[PDB]
Amino acid sequence: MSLQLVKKFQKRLEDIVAYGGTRNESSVRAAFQQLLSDWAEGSGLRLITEVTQKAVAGNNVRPDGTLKDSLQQSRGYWESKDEADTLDDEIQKKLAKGYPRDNIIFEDSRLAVLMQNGEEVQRVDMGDAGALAGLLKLFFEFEPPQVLEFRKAVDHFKDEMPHLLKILREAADAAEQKADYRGERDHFVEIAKEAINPDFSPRDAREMLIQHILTGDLFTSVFDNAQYHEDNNIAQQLQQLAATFYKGPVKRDIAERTKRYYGAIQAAAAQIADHHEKQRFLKALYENFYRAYNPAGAERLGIFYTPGEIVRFMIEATDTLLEKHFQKELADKGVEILDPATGTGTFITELIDFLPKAKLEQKYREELHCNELALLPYYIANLNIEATYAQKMGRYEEFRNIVLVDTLDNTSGLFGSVTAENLERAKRQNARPVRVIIGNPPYRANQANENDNNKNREYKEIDRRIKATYVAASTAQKTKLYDMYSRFLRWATDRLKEDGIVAFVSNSSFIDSRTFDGFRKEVVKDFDHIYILDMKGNANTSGERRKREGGNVFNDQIKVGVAVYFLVRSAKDTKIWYHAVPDFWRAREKLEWLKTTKFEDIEFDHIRPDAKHNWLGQVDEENDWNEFLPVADKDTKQAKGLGQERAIFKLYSLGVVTNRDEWVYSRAEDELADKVRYFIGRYNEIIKLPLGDLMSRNWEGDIKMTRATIADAQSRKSYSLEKNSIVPSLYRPFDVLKMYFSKNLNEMQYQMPSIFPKGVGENVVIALSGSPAAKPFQVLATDILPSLDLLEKTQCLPFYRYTMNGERLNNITDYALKAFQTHYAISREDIFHYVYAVLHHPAYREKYALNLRQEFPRIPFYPEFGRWAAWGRELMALHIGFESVAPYPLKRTDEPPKNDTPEALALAKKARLKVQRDAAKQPTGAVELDGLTTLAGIPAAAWAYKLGNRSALEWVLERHKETTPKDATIREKFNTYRFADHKERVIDLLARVTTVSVETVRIVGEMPAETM
Amino acid sequence: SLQLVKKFQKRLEDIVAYGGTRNESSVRAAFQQLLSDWAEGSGLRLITEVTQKAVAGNNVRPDGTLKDSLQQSRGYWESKDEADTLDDEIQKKLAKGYPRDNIIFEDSRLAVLMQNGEEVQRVDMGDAGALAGLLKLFFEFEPPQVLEFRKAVDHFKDEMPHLLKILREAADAAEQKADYRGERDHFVEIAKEAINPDFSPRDAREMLIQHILTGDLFTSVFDNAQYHEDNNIAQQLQQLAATFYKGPVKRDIAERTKRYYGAIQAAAAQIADHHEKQRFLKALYENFYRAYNPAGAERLGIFYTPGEIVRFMIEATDTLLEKHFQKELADKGVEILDPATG
Amino acid sequence: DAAEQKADYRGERDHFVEIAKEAINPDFSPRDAREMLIQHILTGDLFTSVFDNAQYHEDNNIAQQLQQLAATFYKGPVKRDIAERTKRYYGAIQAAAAQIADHHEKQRFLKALYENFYRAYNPAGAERLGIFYTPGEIVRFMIEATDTLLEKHFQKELADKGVEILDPATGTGTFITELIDFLPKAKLEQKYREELHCNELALLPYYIANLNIEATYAQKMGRYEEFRNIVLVDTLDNTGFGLFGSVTAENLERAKRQNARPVRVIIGNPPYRANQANENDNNKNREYKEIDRRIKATYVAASTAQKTKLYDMYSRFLRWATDRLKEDGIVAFVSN
DNA sequence: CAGCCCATGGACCCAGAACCACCCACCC
DNA sequence: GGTGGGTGGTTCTGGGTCCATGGGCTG
DNA sequence: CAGCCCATGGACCCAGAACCACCCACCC
DNA sequence: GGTGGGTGGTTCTGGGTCCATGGGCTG
DNA sequence: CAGCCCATGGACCCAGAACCACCCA
DNA sequence: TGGGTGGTTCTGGGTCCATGGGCTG
């Protein structure tokens, strides 16, 4: 909408007067007619032209157009006049005949006014696309006052949701005193463990009852279909469960107390009639309920709303692809559709709207099907599709096609036998030959934290198939093809009996993720045409990448990337089309695009998979990146000595993974001591805890129990504190912190011991950015232990290699020396400094940027060799002993705390380390250290040297600012360092880094303009 | 095509649904938008409520006229209310003076196409395939001007011998001016090393008669006078033609060749599609050599390729580029050369 | 406007302004120069498309001095761009005009360009020049009535060799083209070659008249001959019977030759303008030293009126006519 | 080594005839 | 009042040649 | 001589006002 | 089914102002 | 053979900045 | 007349680490 539609209006107004040769209203009025109509068709209204209206003056005033709702109610009006007449003197003439004045766009071909509520809200020039876009926004968004009251009431319900849920929770606690309730509750948890969750817990049945009551009250209060809960199979079952307890004075007690929460919303929803306006309360309840009840279960279910724009685009596109490929149509008999996840019932509510009224009966009765896992969704959905059908046609008819089943587990079996009717339709759906599978599957890879203890429900006969297919062909180490969305994809590739479409909106990871390499190769053998529309929006990125990704198509609620994909399998090769939305784009823009763009007219570049099955980011082959190798898996896994040696190094180390950075690191060893005390002490207490509680993790969450630790406490063995294991280490660029480096508090130590044994070993490591690398390729050489959070996937490349019995034999490969001496007729020592400067070469880091973010940086033989080894020498030494290089002259001034209050002084001693930039964010060479200390004397070359998204200086400043330990046990029950005690040392460290940067810049600057 | 007709049906049902009116004034916006969008693809545009004087002097205003870039009507449309009799309303409107050359008498239910004063096709608007056929015929009706241009192109072929007599006499009367002989001698010697080692003054008089003939029709029938002004090779041959073709010499030749150029210019000016006018370029090409140098036509080869062969050969080279070189004709890097353009 | 970003145009433009500050008007300004350029580019397009006389400019002395100015910017992509945009106005007229053979039907477009260009571009300059067209009926009547009095008082006809007819203000060329249609074919050749003369001050009128006259002759005779008797000169300044008319060298010859021809009949519709409407317009009538001085000695000196409005442009063109008729003849005019 | 044998497939076009439109003689 | 016939136009349709001229021989 | 008086006729244009055309509403 | 508004386009048709600016005084 | 190295992207939230009344100093 | 006051919505901008699969052993 917005610019896209307003720019088409501008072009079509010109072509009317050009092709016709007339500037009269009756001809030129067909340009704004199409602008308004097409805008309305995406907003869910329709501009019907020339509709007569009996006014208070007794005249059937006929305005040029009437914006109307699905309930035939006039919301807005439009009167177009010719450029010849004066708009202002003709508005008065029409308004004096009794023309409506509540929402009317009086418009000439060059000017447009909006008389909202009787007063000109805005007068714009139609030549300016942005101005007209804003005017029409206000016109199509103006709602009558009753609608606005309901809106505010829905907002207020979200505020009261936790409080009414508290009252309902108290009532469910009292239910335990009675044994009649606990009788049918125990029967229910048994019958539910046989159909929904094999691990159904008592708490799960409790939430499932709170849902029956809350939603049962709001199906009589806000909406007026109380009979739904008296005609629904699932409702009747949990109605008995509730009745056993919730009844008589208990029912009345809750009702009277909660009558205040459910009163305001009822008063407002009595005025509203259109279901399309009332269904929005259900969307709010859908999300806010789980927010204020089971947030961890909300993560496992992906309780989210799919904006109507995304659903209407997919429904429209599926129709076009059903004609282009299967010569059929969505409203044709035999094209049955299933939804793997109904949620708030949108993908099927909007299908009802799209389908003709004539063919709506058949499709509703036996050709539209959906599934749901939770109860609130099941109800919210069924209510919606029943009321939508009734509004569109004019007759109420219960939907007999929603089944409450885990679609992933229902693949025989009593999965779905919560009630008899439920299982009847669970097996009926599996019999129906469904052609289209549309939806928004839950996306969940891994889990939030091991402390959260919310793992993904393991799916048998689904992970079985992904293992035989996607994971099989995958060559990546950490295959995250176990995400709930990849499982939903594999289930659907199967559900599709012969030919059809799997149109889903999911994580964009499939388009370009190392783990999903197998999916990219397997899916092309499972489908015939693949159409991907990347909506970008990955906010799990940083720097220029973040701005490029832009806002998320889900109203900036999620942080992952999104992609509307349409996978069609026909009845040659597979045609992989692709269209990414523009970069630096906001959510509103992406959503307006989807609302108006027609699938037919979308530019789709045809991507051709390369040998590595990389659909996107195809590497150039002209570039000669075929030169040596820094490290290759074969060099490391070697037993031939120099036989398979084909690189420059022979040990690939990854930075220590701590898995609990808060407990393993500290600013001073004095604090680490007591931190490791509490941790191991609590583990030693946990191993005494009974085997049962230990196994079920029914313990305390004060310590960050990680995978290995839990299994160690499972052998009930014990640990010990050792102050020798603790050593200084780099976890962040130019920031050294004391680390435990114990096998007990370090989950994955990797091959780091073989570089610096317990930190004692002397070694120089060329740290590298691993593949893939979202942040620009970074490289640095140090002498203290690195972690995986220093550089993106830090891959340390050592100088020497300490062997089993303590022998520091040079790690550097001999093949290199034997391949380098031939080329340039040298010394392994300087060859180390040499490669550092080859990675320091700008043209190399820029021309081969794509290649570098795919594999280990292959090193080109460099003519000079001596000059590169000298370049690298100073560079390496400068970044190793950065702590003691040179105090760059830094102008230091302290400020007074103005009014001498204890607060003012203490406040101006907080960590206010802010880079002072100016105009368009350009550093002015000043850096407030705290409120008092204000540093300066910083050259712009200091800010130029970047070791990632931030500069070498910004990295230091960042880790010198105070933080709030995300770990609650460290946040208050442990240490909280200040900056008023570190300010002096920071000034010194800053000064060193300032010189370090200008020296790096100097060296880098003398490099050739060409790469080999 | 089918897609647009499916959207037409989706709008007609939602106008009577969201608006609750069956009045023609409101239900006509569905067909208006169907025709408007089909037209935008065919290079035409549907302008609405355009008045037109009928034969008896009654201004009649159809509900929409299809106009070309030259602001000329090439089709019409009149929608009525379904609560009526289409055949009865067609007859009354036709009797008011309504044009019958190409008109769609629309009713929310059915539509008839009266082309050339005679019903050609009556369909039901509830059919997405039948309305697509009726509309294809309405938007591909050959107007009188297209047929009268093809007649003129055929007649120019027969009058080319006589037209080339006027131009031959001119190039002969130029061989008396020493300015021409001097320039011609320079051209023959720069074309004896560039085009043919045996370029003769006879070959140069041919290139002149071609530059003159085409430098009149390019500015009249094709309206591209600038082509000759900016074309690299045309500037070299205008340097040989401006030694004589100017002032009263040009005025005499122009007044004697106007009888052969008059008709094509009349018809061509009413055609906007270059695809229609390109049949004249094909006829000038073949017939010039048949009337002037029938022998050089044998040496060079002067037969154009039927478009059906060229379109197949282009579509097939694309299928074969994909199957063997995994590329497409549109992909960057696929350089195409036509050794003998014609 | 985009052409003034090129030093070559600014150079040629500056040379032209200086030349026309001694040939057309002492105060020729950049505004007048750019009007002349816009007129050249507009007439160029329409004369090649609707009137099929592209050669007109390549045989017109004035057109070749003004194509020097236009050749600096109007060529290649610049011309191809303005052409694609302007085709949406020229399209319809071109289509219909190509199916019209009679120039007497196509001369209605010439009248429209003349009266509407000024009304849309320079309404002020239209007032000072008097851009209006004489209805054919009036023109025809005067041509017939002049022949009547030529036979009554001079025993001659308009077709008789010796009667040199001069139109002091041609406009669209109506008077000369209607004389071509009256004069017999056997005598038209000599008259068109040395007895029909005319003068214009504005460029659009000059071009429109030259084409109208040359094409009316062509239709009647069957052959196209160039009219070498049209001069772009201020009639009330070319009283040198001098640098007036020196826009080009041929125009100066034509001016000096015309000021020696023995004129018998001065037919025409002189411009009328007594005063400017409001002082804020700053569009007063130009001062013509010689004519004004002769009006003062003759008309004004013999008038017993307090207010003299005898410096009207029509009164100035009547004094000139009396003086131009050196011996005998008729001054046939239509005026206030 | 310059005569002397040996192939080998070729960038259309134009007379019969059909049939059609129009008008005149010819039956009807 | 057709009908055949005289006259001129307008489509189709069917149906097919001697002879250039490079190369290998060849005495 | 500049600083007062005294004339004297002026190269259109545009708001109603029909009056149609078409068609929704309103009777009929 | 006419019939009168509603809305927009498409022809006539009627009907009419302050104020430039040279020349003549004039003191 | 089963504990031990590698990976690899991850269904938002949060300081902090206008800005908004809002009297009211 | 800022300014305090005291919230109160827009808005840009980025993490450590779960945890399955090869892999010698």
Ligand SMILES: C[S@@+](CC[C@H](N)C(=O)[O-])C[C@H]1O[C@@H](n2cnc3c(N)ncnc32)[C@H](O)[C@@H]1O
């Ligand atoms: C994002 S919502 C579905 C979106 C919804 N169609 C919309 O338009 O807003 C995801 C839903 O999938 C449901 N679901 C159904 N079957 C599921 C399964 N097997 N595993 C996980 N979630 C499932 C969850 O209960 C959750 O409510």
Ligand SMILES: C[S@@+](CC[C@H](N)C(=O)[O-])C[C@H]1O[C@@H](n2cnc3c(N)ncnc32)[C@H](O)[C@@H]1O
């Ligand atoms: C009424 S128009 C000529 C009308 C002409 N009879 C016709 O039928 O078109 C007056 C013309 O006089 C021209 N003209 C010629 N010489 C002039 C001069 N010295 N002063 C003013 N206008 C002059 C103007 O350019 C203007 O076009």
Ligand SMILES: [Ca+2]
């Ligand atoms: Ca209007």
Ligand SMILES: [Ca+2]
């Ligand atoms: Ca109609």
